[PDB]
Design an enzyme around this catalytic site. Sequence first.
Site, PDB file in Angstrom:
ATOM      1  N   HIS A 446      -1.259 -22.601  21.799  1.00 55.84           N
ATOM      2  CA  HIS A 446       0.065 -22.888  21.227  1.00 55.84           C
ATOM      3  C   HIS A 446       0.426 -22.012  20.016  1.00 55.84           C
ATOM      4  O   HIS A 446       0.773 -22.550  18.961  1.00 55.84           O
ATOM      5  CB  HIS A 446       0.138 -24.356  20.775  1.00 55.84           C
ATOM      6  CG  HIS A 446      -0.301 -25.333  21.819  1.00 55.84           C
ATOM      7  ND1 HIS A 446      -0.891 -26.538  21.501  1.00 55.84           N
ATOM      8  CD2 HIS A 446      -0.238 -25.288  23.172  1.00 55.84           C
ATOM      9  CE1 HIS A 446      -1.183 -27.191  22.612  1.00 55.84           C
ATOM     10  NE2 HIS A 446      -0.794 -26.457  23.641  1.00 55.84           N
TER      11      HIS A 446
HETATM   12  C1  LIG Z   1      -2.903 -20.948  29.349  1.00 58.61           C
HETATM   13  C2  LIG Z   1      -1.781 -21.677  28.663  1.00 58.61           C
HETATM   14  C3  LIG Z   1      -1.571 -23.018  28.909  1.00 58.61           C
HETATM   15  C4  LIG Z   1      -0.533 -23.688  28.267  1.00 58.61           C
HETATM   16  N1  LIG Z   1      -0.331 -25.026  28.546  1.00 58.61           N
HETATM   17  C5  LIG Z   1       0.690 -25.712  27.946  1.00 58.61           C
HETATM   18  C6  LIG Z   1       0.881 -27.051  28.251  1.00 58.61           C
HETATM   19  O1  LIG Z   1       0.146 -27.613  29.058  1.00 58.61           O
HETATM   20  N2  LIG Z   1       1.903 -27.745  27.651  1.00 58.61           N
HETATM   21  C7  LIG Z   1       2.727 -27.108  26.750  1.00 58.61           C
HETATM   22  O2  LIG Z   1       3.616 -27.749  26.200  1.00 58.61           O
HETATM   23  N3  LIG Z   1       2.544 -25.783  26.438  1.00 58.61           N
HETATM   24  C8  LIG Z   1       1.528 -25.072  27.044  1.00 58.61           C
HETATM   25  N4  LIG Z   1       1.336 -23.732  26.755  1.00 58.61           N
HETATM   26  C9  LIG Z   1       2.235 -23.067  25.762  1.00 58.61           C
HETATM   27  C10 LIG Z   1       3.584 -22.717  26.353  1.00 58.61           C
HETATM   28  O3  LIG Z   1       3.387 -22.205  27.651  1.00 58.61           O
HETATM   29  C11 LIG Z   1       4.214 -21.671  25.459  1.00 58.61           C
HETATM   30  O4  LIG Z   1       4.163 -22.099  24.109  1.00 58.61           O
HETATM   31  C12 LIG Z   1       5.658 -21.423  25.861  1.00 58.61           C
HETATM   32  O5  LIG Z   1       5.669 -20.953  27.190  1.00 58.61           O
HETATM   33  C13 LIG Z   1       6.239 -20.378  24.914  1.00 58.61           C
HETATM   34  O6  LIG Z   1       7.437 -19.880  25.440  1.00 58.61           O
HETATM   35  P1  LIG Z   1       8.080 -18.553  24.802  1.00 58.61           P
HETATM   36  O7  LIG Z   1       9.469 -18.373  25.392  1.00 58.61           O
HETATM   37  O8  LIG Z   1       8.072 -18.686  23.277  1.00 58.61           O
HETATM   38  O9  LIG Z   1       7.112 -17.340  25.213  1.00 58.61           O
HETATM   39  P2  LIG Z   1       6.606 -17.010  26.707  1.00 58.61           P
HETATM   40  O10 LIG Z   1       6.751 -18.181  27.666  1.00 58.61           O
HETATM   41  O11 LIG Z   1       5.184 -16.518  26.613  1.00 58.61           O
HETATM   42  O12 LIG Z   1       7.600 -15.847  27.196  1.00 58.61           O
HETATM   43  C14 LIG Z   1       7.585 -14.573  26.603  1.00 58.61           C
HETATM   44  C15 LIG Z   1       8.076 -13.620  27.683  1.00 58.61           C
HETATM   45  O13 LIG Z   1       8.486 -12.399  27.100  1.00 58.61           O
HETATM   46  C16 LIG Z   1       8.004 -11.316  27.873  1.00 58.61           C
HETATM   47  N5  LIG Z   1       7.889 -10.186  26.942  1.00 58.61           N
HETATM   48  C17 LIG Z   1       7.021 -10.079  25.883  1.00 58.61           C
HETATM   49  N6  LIG Z   1       7.269  -8.897  25.262  1.00 58.61           N
HETATM   50  C18 LIG Z   1       8.282  -8.267  25.884  1.00 58.61           C
HETATM   51  C19 LIG Z   1       8.916  -7.045  25.658  1.00 58.61           C
HETATM   52  N7  LIG Z   1       8.632  -6.305  24.581  1.00 58.61           N
HETATM   53  N8  LIG Z   1       9.951  -6.664  26.494  1.00 58.61           N
HETATM   54  C20 LIG Z   1      10.337  -7.476  27.542  1.00 58.61           C
HETATM   55  N9  LIG Z   1       9.702  -8.681  27.759  1.00 58.61           N
HETATM   56  C21 LIG Z   1       8.689  -9.072  26.943  1.00 58.61           C
HETATM   57  C22 LIG Z   1       6.669 -11.830  28.395  1.00 58.61           C
HETATM   58  O14 LIG Z   1       6.195 -11.091  29.502  1.00 58.61           O
HETATM   59  C23 LIG Z   1       6.994 -13.289  28.698  1.00 58.61           C
HETATM   60  O15 LIG Z   1       7.564 -13.472  29.982  1.00 58.61           O
HETATM   61  C24 LIG Z   1       0.311 -23.032  27.373  1.00 58.61           C
HETATM   62  C25 LIG Z   1       0.099 -21.682  27.117  1.00 58.61           C
HETATM   63  C26 LIG Z   1      -0.947 -21.021  27.771  1.00 58.61           C
HETATM   64  C27 LIG Z   1      -1.209 -19.581  27.509  1.00 58.61           C
END
Ligand SMILES: Cc1cc2nc3c(=O)[nH]c(=O)nc-3n(C[C@H](O)[C@H](O)[C@H](O)COP(=O)(O)OP(=O)(O)OC[C@H]3O[C@@H](n4cnc5c(N)ncnc54)[C@H](O)[C@@H]3O)c2cc1C
Lengths: 509, 509
Positions: A446
């Site tokens: 997280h």
């Molecule tokens: C293994 C794992 C299990 C998890 N399990 C849970 C759970 O059970 N319950 C829960 O609540 N949370 C869980 N989480 C956490 C949750 O998945 C994340 O906190 C949430 O998805 C964050 O979303 P985000 O939009 O901030 O980033 P992300 O979902 O990681 O999205 C970021 C996106 O940006 C893209 N990106 C990055 N850099 C660039 C760039 N420079 N140019 C273009 N694209 C880019 C990436 O490829 C990715 O698709 C888990 C995380 C992991 C790793």
Amino acid sequence: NCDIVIVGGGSAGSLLAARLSEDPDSRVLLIEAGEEPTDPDIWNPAAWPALQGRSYDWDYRTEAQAGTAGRAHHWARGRLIGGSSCLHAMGYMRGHPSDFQAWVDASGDRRWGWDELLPVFQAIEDHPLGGDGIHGKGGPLPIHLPADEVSPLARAFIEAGASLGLPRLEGHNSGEMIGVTPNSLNIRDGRRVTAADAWLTKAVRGRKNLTILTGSRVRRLKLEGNQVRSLEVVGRQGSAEVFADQIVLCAGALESPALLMRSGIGPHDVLDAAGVGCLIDMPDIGRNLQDHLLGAGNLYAARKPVPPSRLQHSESMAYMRADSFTAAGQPEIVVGCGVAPIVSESFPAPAAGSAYSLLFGITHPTSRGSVRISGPELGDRLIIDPAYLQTGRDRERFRRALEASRTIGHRDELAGWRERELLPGTPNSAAEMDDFIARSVITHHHPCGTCRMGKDPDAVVDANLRLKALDNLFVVDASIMPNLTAGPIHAAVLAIAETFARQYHHHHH
Amino acid sequence: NCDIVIVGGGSAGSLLAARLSEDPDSRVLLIEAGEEPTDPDIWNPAAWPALQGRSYDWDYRTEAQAGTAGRAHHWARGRLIGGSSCLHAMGYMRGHPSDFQAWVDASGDRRWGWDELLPVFQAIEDHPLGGDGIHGKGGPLPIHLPADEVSPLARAFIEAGASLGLPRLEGHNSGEMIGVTPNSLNIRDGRRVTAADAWLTKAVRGRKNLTILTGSRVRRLKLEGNQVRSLEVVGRQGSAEVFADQIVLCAGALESPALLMRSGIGPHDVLDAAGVGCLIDMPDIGRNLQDHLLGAGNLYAARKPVPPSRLQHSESMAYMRADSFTAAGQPEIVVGCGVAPIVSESFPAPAAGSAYSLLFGITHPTSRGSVRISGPELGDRLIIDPAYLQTGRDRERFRRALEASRTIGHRDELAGWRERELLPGTPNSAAEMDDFIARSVITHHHPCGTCRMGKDPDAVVDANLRLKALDNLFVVDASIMPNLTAGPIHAAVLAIAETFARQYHHHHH
Ligand SMILES: Cc1cc2nc3c(=O)[nH]c(=O)nc-3n(C[C@H](O)[C@H](O)[C@H](O)COP(=O)(O)OP(=O)(O)OC[C@H]3O[C@@H](n4cnc5c(N)ncnc54)[C@H](O)[C@@H]3O)c2cc1C
Ligand SMILES: Cc1cc2nc3c(=O)[nH]c(=O)nc-3n(C[C@H](O)[C@H](O)[C@H](O)COP(=O)(O)OP(=O)(O)OC[C@H]3O[C@@H](n4cnc5c(N)ncnc54)[C@H](O)[C@@H]3O)c2cc1C
């Protein structure tokens, strides 16, 4: 020209691409580094620890952590449409109302309070308690409350906790989070549902005003005056320049501040060290990194075979106060029932089926770390130091979490499953407990906080998620969170994107 | 008191005795009619047609079949620890995903779908492609993919099929079943492996909570209220009453509905005719009997000596669509290469070594037959009418199978082996083809369906394999299958028992 470019199509980005393109008058471009999902196993809920380390995982390595026996840690992030939601343990926990109260204190804006987030969560959720006036009904994200599929081990765990005084909850999302329950899951008809599945439907992707560009990594934002003018996008077979009136960053807790820093926006000294010219000195970019830890683990040899679980393997988190199983309020520690013998790399793995782990952690670490770029390029590795277990508070709270875990673990209610405790054994001192905890803790996955929202001058974004130094640039993902929620942060991330989506439809043209 | 009695220690029963007794808190009794295996030849894979007609074969005789030139048929079943697995051609075919889709439609439960059965099959299999994410690794049942030991005849057969457009598969179990390949076999280190060998190991048989009672035939279940209270067991030197909390029937496609009927549970009119009092009128018990047929055979005189085969004599099944060698999907017909001149009793046997048979059949017959007891006693012969070739669909599909066989048979790729076609010759009409097919078909030995699982009121068991009218009685063997799988049904039977074993460990105490 596209009115809005969204960078990163993960959890927040998928929601935003769908919600913003609902206005047919606004042209939306979503840029995602990963490819479209092709791996079948990621829609199998029990295969979730088996897909990190694969093609669509970013796989970071933190600095060696002095607070964790000098161990370095692997942070796995998704690189595909859906981001970390295609990799996730699919648990759904809004958090506790007190978690969000601290966001109101930090931001100076009541929109980040539980009362205001309530309809937001509701808009997101398709929950079987919908009609509640608490849980959402008809929203795009299915919330599943397991009952019959809950493993017998997890039921015995729940009974153990209930018998110590923990109340029985139906999921963790009513506003009451302390107690005993199966975790609610983003599952429908037996299959996991990602943020991409939920918001980026066939119908949504068919909209004329929405373009999705995959396999495409944003390297730099180009500035003119107080505005982002364009984005340099690096694709498979070359780079190119995309123009936009408004830019929203959704690249996640690591990649959002990284993109900012590559763009000349961040701590001047860090940018110099990385060989990047500083255009905007913003000392907090990359700072205040937070993450949850789980001790892996309070390991028990099983009296009988442990099945590979009909669900997601970590079926039940018990949040509680550190000093009592009867006290209510905002959680301080958590013990989770793992229907897999999960242990850190500091411990030999037990034969499958032969053991289970109670996972233990603290819900609100006071440790604060940082991320910084090491160079201007995409492939220059991030320097990540989450500062795990650096504060006396975090170490002390962790001792209580371990004690709570062992207390639950040794209950009569679990005597049908428990052959004996394998780990830690019985440490005779705080020092020995601290050492066991340091060798055992692993990331809960997280990471957040690195572009913190705040009302103070050096916060990275304001209450409206606008980067303070510029006029058309927003950060809308885990990086803005002033503080961790008690549990998994996916719901909070989704709530962040939904309140941004509402704010956008509310004022523009 | 024993918590669970399993009736019949064949394929499903052996798996169940092993898997259920893994819970040391549950006492398991396995009752098997046959003796412990003493015949050495049954562990010689090439001696498999030579052991039916012997001491440990039940050897049934069907009613005369109007659809098969008035011929009556011999059905051989095993009577020993291991059941039909000690007699079997040891081929391993999961079936096609569409086979199991019809089970989901019939049962209303997704647990019977390919996606859910995947881990089940995986748990069963020790397969050299394990790690696939498709085939199992480390399971108790060895799956062997022949390569070097495949006879030159079978290789030429495979080449013949490949040249017509059939794709080359590695076994039939990836989810793709149409194509060309050696059959996978339950063999290890050259020796066949039965279900009894695989699950009833020395270690398993040594468990204190498992009792195996051989030479013992269950004659009746005794009812009290909505529960089975006890079993009347007939042994060598008398009968006796066994009490149990839970009863699982694994007596196979014929003997399970027979035991039900002897117990007063079945079609009222049938029970009356057999002189058994009806306690529970269940009209579908004994109905919906299914079996695969093989035309024996499309016989070819050989240009040179055919060796007695380094394997199991039917080395290669080619499943395909009826109208094209290039089309994919769920199989409709099959042609198999027989390294023995196999012919029905309607044809004189060719001198050994002088000829081979292409065996041809349909994979999903729509004909439906029945089994009924003729009296209350153990030795009263079952009346078995599989209704072979009763539907126009089955007859028509069979014509396509024969045509496909002859087309493969006359390929240049087989010209090194083929001297000339002996059977059928060249029929000038559908009538003459139908007559040849009727005289040539023999059982493939896959009877099933007689205690059908379904969601409708008159199904025999529900999705959980519980007999609908009672509370502590399960049927877990070939008798529950809503429909035949495309090929041999052993794997599906094993999958049925494994999902029951999981379901049991999941809910009890
Ligand atoms: C293994 C794992 C299990 C998890 N399990 C849970 C759970 O059970 N319950 C829960 O609540 N949370 C869980 N989480 C956490 C949750 O998945 C994340 O906190 C949430 O998805 C964050 O979303 P985000 O939009 O901030 O980033 P992300 O979902 O990681 O999205 C970021 C996106 O940006 C893209 N990106 C990055 N850099 C660039 C760039 N420079 N140019 C273009 N694209 C880019 C990436 O490829 C990715 O698709 C888990 C995380 C992991 C790793
Ligand atoms: C000759 C032959 C070859 C085969 N080859 C293949 C093959 O190559 N590939 C494949 O997939 N399948 C093959 N099969 C089919 C497969 O073997 C069966 O479908 C499978 O074994 C069925 O298992 P079951 O548990 O339903 O019944 P069975 O394995 O037949 O077990 C039933 C058991 O119950 C016992 N029993 C019956 N009545 C009573 C009673 N009243 N009291 C106590 N015990 C009782 C029997 O003695 C027997 O041990 C073959 C079958 C035969 C006959």
